[PDB]
Amino acid sequence: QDWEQYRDRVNMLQQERIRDSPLLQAAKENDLRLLKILLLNQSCDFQQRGAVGETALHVAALYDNLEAATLLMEAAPELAKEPALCEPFVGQTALHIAVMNQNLNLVRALLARGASVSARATGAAFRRSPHNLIYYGEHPLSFAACVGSEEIVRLLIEHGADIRAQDSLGNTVLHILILQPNKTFACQMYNLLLSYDEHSDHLQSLELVPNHQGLTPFKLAGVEGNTVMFQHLMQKRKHVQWTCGPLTSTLYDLTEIDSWGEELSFLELVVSSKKREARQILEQTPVKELVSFKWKKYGRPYFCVLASLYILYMICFTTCCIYRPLKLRDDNRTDPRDITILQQKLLQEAYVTHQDNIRLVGELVTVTGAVIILLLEIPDIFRVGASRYFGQTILGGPFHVIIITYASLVLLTMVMRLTNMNGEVVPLSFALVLGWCSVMYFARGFQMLGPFTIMIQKMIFGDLMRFCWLMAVVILGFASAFHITFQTEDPNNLGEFSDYPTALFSTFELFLTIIDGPANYSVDLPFMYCITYAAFAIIATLLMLNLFIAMMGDTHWRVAQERDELWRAQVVATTVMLERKMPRFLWPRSGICGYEYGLGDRWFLRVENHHD
Amino acid sequence: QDWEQYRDRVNMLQQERIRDSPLLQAAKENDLRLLKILLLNQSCDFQQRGAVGETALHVAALYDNLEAATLLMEAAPELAKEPALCEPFVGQTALHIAVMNQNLNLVRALLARGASVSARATGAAFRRSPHNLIYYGEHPLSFAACVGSEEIVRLLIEHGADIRAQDSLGNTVLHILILQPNKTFACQMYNLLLSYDEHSDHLQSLELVPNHQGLTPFKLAGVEGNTVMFQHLMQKRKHVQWTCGPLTSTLYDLTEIDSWGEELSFLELVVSSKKREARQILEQTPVKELVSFKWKKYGRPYFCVLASLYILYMICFTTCCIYRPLKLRDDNRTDPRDITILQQKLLQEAYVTHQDNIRLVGELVTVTGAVIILLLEIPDIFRVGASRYFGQTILGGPFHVIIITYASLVLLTMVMRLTNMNGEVVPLSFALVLGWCSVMYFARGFQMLGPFTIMIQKMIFGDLMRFCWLMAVVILGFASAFHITFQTEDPNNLGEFSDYPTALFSTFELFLTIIDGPANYSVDLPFMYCITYAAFAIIATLLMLNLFIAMMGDTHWRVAQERDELWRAQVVATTVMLERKMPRFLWPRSGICGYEYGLGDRWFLRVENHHD
């Protein structure tokens, strides 16, 4: 069964036992007079529970019923301390339910009895999933903070609610408020929980308490794509120096963005986030002024020096494919089967020559230039995880599938040599169509060439191959029908259709008008040919091509703001990708340090404004 | 004559007799003093009527004239009970006319005399037609309900107006209010007529009273495309279970949408409606949450299993066309008429062979796979009606003309065999260009491939064949003018124009630049050729092709919202089309039933909200 149909059984079987039991019936309906009388004559033993396993007070708190709920707590002393027992609802007590409803007087009544403010709700319907519409955490302080009810929030802290508790995923009360869809109404709540902070607990500040996967609530505001909470967490870390007219020289702290850490870099997590909204943190005023300083000062010359050691490499690999050891044809086997054109095979002559030694040192450059590419890509596979890394389209994208299968086919051609294999022309032709089309990677600078090469990528996955599933059928339709008409005829006159793997290939060419329409006006073609071909020229090359241009012409202004918003996030992905690699010799640390103009040990970045 | 000019005679001949008669003259003009005097001296015998046949009171009520109308009813006792007699105005009494004008005191005066509130207006100008601007039904209660005059509405019910009466089309008072252009102002009226309901008449509820063609006013709110009345009729059939914070788990009834009926399914009538507005019921909140449950759970795997038994069928029919019994050419007739290329004809050799028995069982699959297609399409013709079914473009569309003329040409090729006919290549070439281009039907899932294959259909009916009526003329213009210049010349040098059925076909190819411009630089072409061809290359292949790309390029962003609104109504058409076919083994009935969590016997669907 699906889980969606499993919980629909449980939420409806609960509604049966409320109808069956007379005590639970009056709780929902606020029948006070029954609940006074039915609790006199042996007030019912409260293991009498629903199929979920809840008491009468959980039913009385699930509905807005003050007066019936208080009469149950007077007769029964301990209903505030009982959990539910069904597996998607484990531990949800009456205090978890009264807080959710924002019921002001019922929470006051429950806390007067001493209900535990540290009860976990560990059910399978409270954990975060794409098929649960709420994620409010486990502790009841977290329930009050997410519903925007500030009066219950300050009421629980006065009774012992600890703002430093964590749920099973590790999220504290601050991690959850960033994960809420109501973005602009949690900033009022985040100011409140900092005033209740102990300021005694050394655990360093609550803003720096880590998740299980390592994210602090500052660092989680970036990954989530929360542009409102990012500015709020930055008001603590800027200093205003002077205001001279319209100018204002404010001074940002730059420590939780200038992370000098082994793998938890803030600028890595923002660009490699799967959330679409994370590409807008990169335009906020302490960050946009930073990654346009790394790029224009250092990241642009090191990416133009290194994009011409890769043109001078591929121009050293084609001139060692052209010059390759072809002897003369030492055989007369081309005279049988006059259909064959073939001539001179191969050699083993890198040694005995005057111009295969200049060719030799042009090969060992290409041999030890395809092992360096394997040493800079393979240990970068495991860090991201081999399935995110080949598909992000920003963090490299599908230019790491090409750049490895280029460097793998240079090493095969070495093993095709030194053992005297024959088909050396098969990897050399796959290397040169992939090796040059990887030089197209280095248009990630060059604002001119930049956003164009995304559109090639976006029209080869989205809009070309949905045109090609419905044309592997039309060129199987007509191509297997031209083979039938010319199966009778002679192949010496109009012999484009002589064998069935070329019946498909001549018809795929006729689709593109590359080959002309096959006609011979000195002979009688069969009459069935000119009917099937007058239908092929309307479906294939009026309609199907001129509608593919139109499909290309309207999905290009839909992606108008979206490829240009994606290019500026592809310069930031290049700058952090280089800062892992190049050694500390190159790249002094960004920002003016502060131990000589002595305030501390932090590394600052100065940005001045103009009030328009 | 037209009917439009026939009623213009009658409405103007009526205006003559008002001018001719002195009694009827003063009624329109509110000349009270004449109407007091002219009714003293033998008050005129009221068979004196117009050419339509109306009395003086119908003229007095056709104009807003209280005082003249009351003076006629005092002198003449029975003018409230007289009908008009002309055929487009049969039965329209004075009470039908006073109600239309929203005249408050004149309706009070007529009902005090005892005018019949059940008089039918059976004229030919009150029935529904595209050339009558009003459709208000027949009974006078229906006239008051459509004009938005609530005070006349409650006045007629107090005197005996029956809200359960029907007109000649069968529409009750509730069916008509849905058919009105003033959509948002009849919801106030529909609440009113339910309070006047007897609640004594077993006839089950007035919301379920059928039309003559079977439509209840709920079911008529969907076919008409009335998105406002659909939500109003659904407020009666939803239950709210709980509200937990922003959540709200409401519970829809799902009985008049979950119709388990022989042919009156609600989801069939909405998608096959000719009205354009009916494609917006499929986005309302109890229905959009239903047909995305049938599709994603059951309708998507059964449409991907069954779209690969149709690739593995057409890949079993082409490899029994390629392998077909061609012998060697046992004749030397190709040596006379050396223009002929032909060779080996046919056989009767499915029997004596080692590899025509593997071919034999690949034919009987294709024989009894084109009789199954005939058994699943022919009894579905008569249900929709053979003229709606082949043109809806949503309920299948023109993939049922292809899929029958594919399965018909497999059965001809069987009769071309077994009798030794010759032209077997003529149906095999029509089957393979239609059989594959029917696999393109199965892009009705696959959101990627989905909206693209509508645009092929919309540019083959709308925008290609209005380009082809004005190019059956240009390639008859130039093609019959190239035959004239080369009728003199010799066909062995530049012989594309040697016969008039190829003078058209070489010129149709020259339009598309497929064939090169016919030139031979070693001989003198006639000088008239290079003038007519320098005009052909400007009209045909600068202007006429590059303007067809532009026509394709601007009618594609007009249909931008409209092909994507049409794809989501083409998934709903597939889901209900499959639910007729596949047996009950597959497909338990949708929605949680309710006899175990005992409220009734109805089948419910749970949907929860979030208040933004």
Curated annotation (Swiss-Prot), chains A, B:
Topological domain spans for side Extracellular: 323-359, 417-422
ANK repeats: 18-48, 52-81, 90-119, 136-165, 169-202, 213-242
Keywords recorded for this protein, A-Z: ANK repeat, Calcium, Calcium channel, Calcium transport, Calmodulin-binding, Cell membrane, Glycoprotein, Ion channel, Ion transport, Membrane, Metal-binding, Phosphoprotein, Repeat, Transmembrane, Transmembrane helix, Transport
Keyword Metal-binding: yes
Cytoplasmic-facing ranges: 1-301, 383-393, 444-466
Effect of residue 524 to A: Minor effects on Ca(2+) permeation
Membrane spanning residue stretches: 302-322, 360-382, 394-416, 423-443, 467-487, 531-551
Region Interaction with S100A10: start-end pairs: 572-576
GO biological process terms held by the UniProt record: calcium ion homeostasis; calcium ion import across plasma membrane; calcium ion transmembrane transport; calcium ion transport; protein homotetramerization; regulation of urine volume
Tissue and organ distribution: Detected in kidney cortex, in distal convoluted tubules and cortical collecting ducts (at protein level). Detected in duodenum, jejunum, ileum, kidney and placenta.
Reaction catalyzed: Ca(2+)(in) = Ca(2+)(out)
Notes on how activity is controlled: Activated by WNK3.
Compartments where found: Cell membrane; Apical cell membrane
Binding sites annotated in the UniProt record for Ca(2+): 516
Membrane topology classification: Multi-pass membrane protein
Changes after translation: Glycosylated.
Protein task: Constitutively active calcium selective cation channel thought to be involved in Ca(2+) reabsorption in kidney and intestine. Required for normal Ca(2+) reabsorption in the kidney distal convoluted tubules. The channel is activated by low internal calcium level and the current exhibits an inward rectification. A Ca(2+)-dependent feedback regulation includes fast channel inactivation and slow current decay. Heteromeric assembly with TRPV6 seems to modify channel properties. TRPV5-TRPV6 heteromultimeric concatemers exhibit voltage-dependent gating.
Homology family: Belongs to the transient receptor (TC 1.A.4) family. TrpV subfamily. TRPV5 sub-subfamily.
Quaternary structure annotation from Swiss-Prot or TrEMBL: Homotetramer. Probably forms heterotetramers with TRPV6. Interacts with TRPV6. Interacts with S100A10 and probably with the ANAX2-S100A10 heterotetramer. The interaction with S100A10 is required for the trafficking to the plasma membrane. Interacts with calmodulin. Interacts with BSPRY, which results in its inactivation.
Stated name of the protein: Transient receptor potential cation channel subfamily V member 5
Organism: Oryctolagus cuniculus
Gene that specifies this protein: Trpv5
Range within the parent protein: 27 to 638 of 730
